[PDB]
């Protein structure tokens, strides 16, 4: 066990290994704080993440394990992972904290204030990172700039992914408007609004609430035919795109004028209505906007992963002891 001490950084309390030196507070939130660190044992800057309150309740602490479970599983380039976790208990019974450290990471999107070949890039990284996370059937739901990392060498990274855990304006309309069974695809509507508004400088659809959301949406894809309002189980849902008076999808080419057509296309198939006819990560790969890009050999799908705890209602201590097991079990990245 290494050697720890404090220091008290703008209203919170750190106790973190020697390794980590030069704490500088970088961000915030009810869910945990954040400083850049630099690891003396790897010469390279990182981000350790203080929980706040992990086990403050048992939904607390079955978020704090499920955020452990996931982080010990991402293993790809374009997905934020696990260079280390820590607690400064030396028992479970003391066990109150927990911290985590990954590589840090410059800025993300919405701070970016961009070209062709950089949206190429950008997306491209995203929609790798997805394939992967989809593939461990994880969902990450909310998609935005804001959870997007990014480096000034345009290496990017998702965050916050997983597993259960404006943001409307980046939101799929079926998860919207509370039609609970989605799939994996509501993440590919988020991507094509990231990518509409890195080509166009403006949010796609910025909705003042869910209802105002919805009606700039059907604007630019049009109302559902029959075939998707067929698949509508709730007659309050139905209803109400039935209430609206009708609207034609517009022809993508003129709302997003003068960008590379390919984009425009890419665009189309990502931002349909119908979630079962959305384009899917992998298929995206494979679209001819990144053929600059695109190498199927090197475009990884993930291990298998066990989120049954998902379905558990346990105590608290035995969410914790489950999160410190997962804590002590940790093996180092190579
Ligand atoms: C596995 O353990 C970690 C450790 C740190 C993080 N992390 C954050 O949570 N940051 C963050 C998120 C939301 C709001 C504010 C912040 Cl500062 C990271 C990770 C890497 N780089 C950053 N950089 C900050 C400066 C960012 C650009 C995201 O604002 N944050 C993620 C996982």
Redesign the pocket.
């Known amino acids: 066990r290494p050697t720890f001490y404090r220091q008290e950084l703008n209203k919170t309390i750190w106790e973190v290994p020697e390794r980590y030196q030069n704490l500088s507070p970088?961000?915030?939130?009810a869910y945990?704080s954040?400083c850049?660190a630099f690891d003396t044992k790897t010469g390279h800057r990182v981000?350790?993440?203080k929980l706040s309150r992990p086990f403050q309740s048992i939904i607390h602490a079955k978020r704090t394990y499920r955020e452990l479970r996931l982080?010990k599983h991402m293993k790809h380039e374009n997905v934020?992972?696990?260079?280390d976790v820590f607690t400064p208990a030396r028992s479970l019974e003391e066990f109150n904290d927990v911290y985590?450290?990954?590589?840090?990471?410059?800025?993300?999107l919405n701070?970016i204030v961009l070209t062709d070949d950089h949206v190429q890039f950008l997306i491209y990284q995203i929609l790798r990172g997805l394939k992967y996370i989809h593939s461990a059937d994880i969902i990450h739901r909310d998609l935005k700039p804001?959870?997007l990392?990014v480096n000034e060498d345009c290496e990017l990274?998702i965050?916050?992914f997983g597993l259960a855990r404006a943001t409307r304006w980046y939101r799929a309309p079926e998860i919207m408007l509370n039609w609970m069974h989605y799939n994996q695809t509501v993440d590919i509507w988020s991507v094509g609004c990231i990518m509409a508004e890195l080509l166009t400088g403006r949010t796609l659809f910025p909705g003042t609430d869910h209802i105002d959301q919805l009606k700039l949406i059907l604007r630019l894809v049009g109302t559902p035919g029959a075939e998707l309002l067929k698949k509508i189980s709730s007659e309050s849902a139905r209803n109400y795109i039935q209430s609206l008076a009708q609207m034609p999808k517009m022809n993508f080419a003129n709302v997003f004028i003068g960008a590379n057509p390919l984009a425009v296309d890419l665009l189309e198939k990502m931002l349909v209505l119908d979630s079962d006819k959305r384009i899917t990560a992998a298929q995206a790969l494979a679209h001819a906007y990144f053929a600059q890009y695109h190498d199927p050999d090197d475009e990884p799908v993930a291990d298998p992963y066990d989120q049954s705890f998902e379905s558990r209602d346990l105590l608290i201590d035995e969410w914790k002891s489950l999160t410190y097991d997962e804590v002590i079990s940790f093996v180092p990245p190579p």
Do not use: E, P, R
Request: charged share 15%.
């Open positions: 970088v961000g915030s939130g945990g954040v850049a981000a350790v993440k982080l934020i992972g696990l260079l985590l450290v990954t590589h840090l990471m410059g800025a993300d701070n804001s959870n990392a990274k965050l916050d």
